[PDB]
Symmetry: D3
Amino acid sequence: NDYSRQNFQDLNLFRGLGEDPAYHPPVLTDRPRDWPLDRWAEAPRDLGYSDFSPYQWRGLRMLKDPDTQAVYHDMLWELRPRTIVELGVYNGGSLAWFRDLTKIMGIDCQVIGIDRDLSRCQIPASDMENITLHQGDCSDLTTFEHLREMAHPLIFIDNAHANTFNIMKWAVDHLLEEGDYFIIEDMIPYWYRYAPQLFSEYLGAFRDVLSMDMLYANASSQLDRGVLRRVAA
Amino acid sequence: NDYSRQNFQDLNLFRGLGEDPAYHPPVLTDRPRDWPLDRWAEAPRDLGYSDFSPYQWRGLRMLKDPDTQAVYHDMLWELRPRTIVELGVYNGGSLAWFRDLTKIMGIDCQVIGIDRDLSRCQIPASDMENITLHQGDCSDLTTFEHLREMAHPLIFIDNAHANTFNIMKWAVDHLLEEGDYFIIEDMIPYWYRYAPQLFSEYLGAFRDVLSMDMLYANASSQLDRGVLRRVA
Amino acid sequence: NDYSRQNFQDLNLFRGLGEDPAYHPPVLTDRPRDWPLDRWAEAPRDLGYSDFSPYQWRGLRMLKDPDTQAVYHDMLWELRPRTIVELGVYNGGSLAWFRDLTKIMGIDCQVIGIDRDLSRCQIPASDMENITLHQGDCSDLTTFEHLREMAHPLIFIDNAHANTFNIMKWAVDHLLEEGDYFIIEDMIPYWYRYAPQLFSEYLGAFRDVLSMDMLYANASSQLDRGVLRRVAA
Amino acid sequence: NDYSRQNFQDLNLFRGLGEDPAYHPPVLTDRPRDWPLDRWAEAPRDLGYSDFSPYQWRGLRMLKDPDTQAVYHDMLWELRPRTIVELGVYNGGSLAWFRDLTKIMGIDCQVIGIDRDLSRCQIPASDMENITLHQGDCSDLTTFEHLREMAHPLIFIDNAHANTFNIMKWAVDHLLEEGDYFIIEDMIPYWYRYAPQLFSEYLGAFRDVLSMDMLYANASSQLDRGVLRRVA
Amino acid sequence: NDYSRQNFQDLNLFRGLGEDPAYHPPVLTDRPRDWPLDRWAEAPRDLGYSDFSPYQWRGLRMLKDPDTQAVYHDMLWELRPRTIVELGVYNGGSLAWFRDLTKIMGIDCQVIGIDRDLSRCQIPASDMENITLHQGDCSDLTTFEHLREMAHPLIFIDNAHANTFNIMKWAVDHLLEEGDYFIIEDMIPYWYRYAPQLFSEYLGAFRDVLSMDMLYANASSQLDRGVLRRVA
Amino acid sequence: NDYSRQNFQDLNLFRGLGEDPAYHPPVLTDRPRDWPLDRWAEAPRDLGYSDFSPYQWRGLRMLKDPDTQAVYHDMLWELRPRTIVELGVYNGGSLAWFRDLTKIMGIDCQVIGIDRDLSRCQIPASDMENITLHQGDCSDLTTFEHLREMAHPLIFIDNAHANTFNIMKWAVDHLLEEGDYFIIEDMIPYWYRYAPQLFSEYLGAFRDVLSMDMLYANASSQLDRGVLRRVAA
């Protein structure tokens, strides 16, 4: 009856993201927010709403969860990066977070976000000091040429996962110095599950130039086995 | 420095599929195939290889796992379908299974397979009986308008998950008769997770045409609340 | 009261078997079969019925569950047995299954079922091509003498668990050839549990003639640690 | 070789019971008993032997585990039974436990065990005070009906599982008074798995005479849903 | 044998805190920090060190774990407190965090720590902007009187848990305005476990003045059922 | 209202013990005691009450759970101790138990209990045979000095945890002989979590005098890695 002349959107677009880049607080449905203390023991114990992607940072959605934030905090504190690069931006929450966190730490850090599509970015123009947004394209490597001009140390973070190994070869040869991080969030465990032989070969090809950092690599489900850095040349 | 001269295939292409459409028997790494019986108790208890998609049917890879296979066995025995349609073929294992199973049940069933790329299908020529392949895109409703007429009852299976709700729409107005299935494997639970609001509106738009068949919808992790059918 | 009336069957007779050897599909008792799509998310998430042995093959009950079926399929495809023997028949579901699967693979296989009690066999006589039943007592080795006439490779399957180790001893001495399987379903983990010393001694006495096939021994809970085959002398 | 030297006993005889009715203390195989304290963190953290039936009472094996022991303790304290009956004996560990436990609690209680085979009973002749052994067949009610006029309250325990629904009918009419227990240990969950319809129908038949004691029925896995008592 | 030479500090002093108020980075103990990529699949998958209280903020230990930090983040953003009070200080790590997180948010917030022992504090005098440390006793209630004269909204956090119920009475009667929070961290699940009736009675006494806030109360294991506020 | 005119006990007093040293049977709250057998399958499958310390012994509260009781039984059966010392008494439940058990075993055993506060003891003097009680602080070694000559073999059990290592040193030097046990219930795993470095130093300082009995050390969650005795290697 109601499926009539409707163009149904492709729900695959909202994968790992959600419907809305803007942040809205969770709302309770099956209980009152103000539970009475005389009935305190009868109150339900579950969260009350979806824990899909519930985190925020100053009113922007944060796709990086608390355990991941904790790892990056330690990494920032130890490395004191002059440059953090995000390939894959979405709403920009994690950019502002990296910027904020580096400011509180007293680290002179320029944060850079690269994406094919920047139209979902929720960072207001007034809150953009030391955050630069570049419109790029993973399959074209000359995109990345800009900002070999940038300062070190440097953390390069892949959240896009398109031409990753090629981008890695570029970064190793043209960008990273010893100590710099190249990080692949989320995807490495899935590539190993689906393509165990090719994955092991491809990662293994970078063994003279990149190490898995074992202090951080097992510390969150999002960074699981994906934290690499440049070994001594 | 092997990264310097090396062709990096795009690894996302294998998502949900594997790296090779042809079947290869599992290989044991950290044990012998023959475990000595006087040390029986000290044998490892784990599988010995990855359980990603280790299933086969007659030398062809099978991406439908044993409990999914059992559900379809029951469905095919109840419904006695004269057509089965697979949106998404890959190596063709499931096509060959559906055809073999219906034949062994005594059921005259045509199996139809639709895919963007049929260059991966592994079904030997010598047994393509009652299988019809079609090459086409899912983002194109034209791929379905071109289909010739099919017998009933019918089962339509979505293993491709592109433009799925528009295809459901086309299927309800131009294909499905009362008692015919439209099954979305795998994806329903993810779509609810990622886009609960829109998923809900979309599914509920079919409230007067499709229902969820609770006999089968909770019977396997792959078919999990995705087995629908046409009600009067 | 209702109890003074009844006769009360021995419920131990249905151990591992169920009440009725004939197949009837599951039925939903506490929800509609057709759940409305506007309330999809409210739908109950559990199976809906008993998960004991709700399995079938062409309207006969299947006591071997899906994972077990998957192991036998790989085993049949690799080995291509000329003979499969089921010690312990019940309804014949696995007999019909084995025969159907070998026909589909183009294998010339004679399926043989041995039991003291053949009265629960549900296979129609019109559908007994390449299946043979045979009456016999497990403790009487005469029961198995006609097996020596059969072609190989051979898979011998114990679903009876009476006199098992003497039957194994006999199979090694008079029946089994290199490559043939001797398989004990279900019982071996229990025998190890209740009598670890005698069980380890008994199994280990076959160390020169049989081995545990580790490609199949861990692949199903029913076949768990019970898949054995004849090694080379 | 060795399989031909062997006289193979039937291992189904040992089901639920173990190989030897006499108690032997567990032994470590892959560690020293005395772990050096300077490598305390290196010590393995598993049990170190099989937990099939590791329990004992005063040198006799105990087939009832600590969780079950604790329920029977509370039940004895509340009910203060003059008689505890055990259908099925084995080594008599639980018979001696029931006796010793009622003695320290000050309860005057005769313990009676009944079995087809009493030759496995490990209880010393000179430690058999307030314990009676009775030979008899379960699928045959002459065993039960003759030996009677036992004092109340009463606890009747099934550890045999032979003709249980008929023994239950005999007990409600000719033995049990209000507040007495009839307990089926272990077997209730299996009869429900294998015969849901026949089992629900049979227990439902006793609806006006027995009930499930909910204070004790969920409190151990052996007693799981098998604690019944005589409500009038 | 140097048990008779050794001097034993009270290990109870470190319960829930650790040996050292100063932060030190985790030490890797049975693996290299740099795992070679040709052996990537063979790298161990566990953390590499103890997950006891491994967290930090800007070189200071953080006893509030990331899940709890996420809850307080939302709370600060929503409430926008002018005052945050921590009953129990230790190293000052969460004092510094609260202050930093409110500056970042553009909120004008004074942060206050109260403990009988402030000598474990690790915050340099360099950066005590909007942080005040007060010498306090949980048994004395004159201790808390300085808090009355300062701005709301207000979050009051008990990390000390001595004479808590009297402090909640004082706070309700003399401090908390509508909107303001009283948060007991960690202990409520334990008090209810050990003292269900007395705890239910005691919490029950605040039914007209405080309510449990279900948005934040189940969102972390440290705040579990302990987030209360002056409302209703 | 009720809060402002209510006297609040310090709830930390009850940590690890409960509100009442006297035993009260559990009580069903949301179901009838007697469930009807026509609705047997529809019966709830959980305990129906709180499992904090539901355990008793002859009308006295038991804080040691059944698993711990089974270990101590085996310990008593093998060691056949003449003395059993409990540091920590609370209600005396365990004292009455140890005494009863040794008596039923034929073991002539004196049970000693030590606590700063004996006022919660619930054991009737009518059954106080072979039970001695002392009043004293643990933080004072004098409490252990004033103890008389005790018979061996011996089990010394710590349930108080106040100055455990100096008490251990006093035990080893002045009390324990070949075979005697020193057991620390509950606390060892917490000291190891909160202070791994200082705990490993202190325990390993007894490496010549005490050793962890592996037959019992892993046999219960309460006695976990805390069962020590004066034996070599």
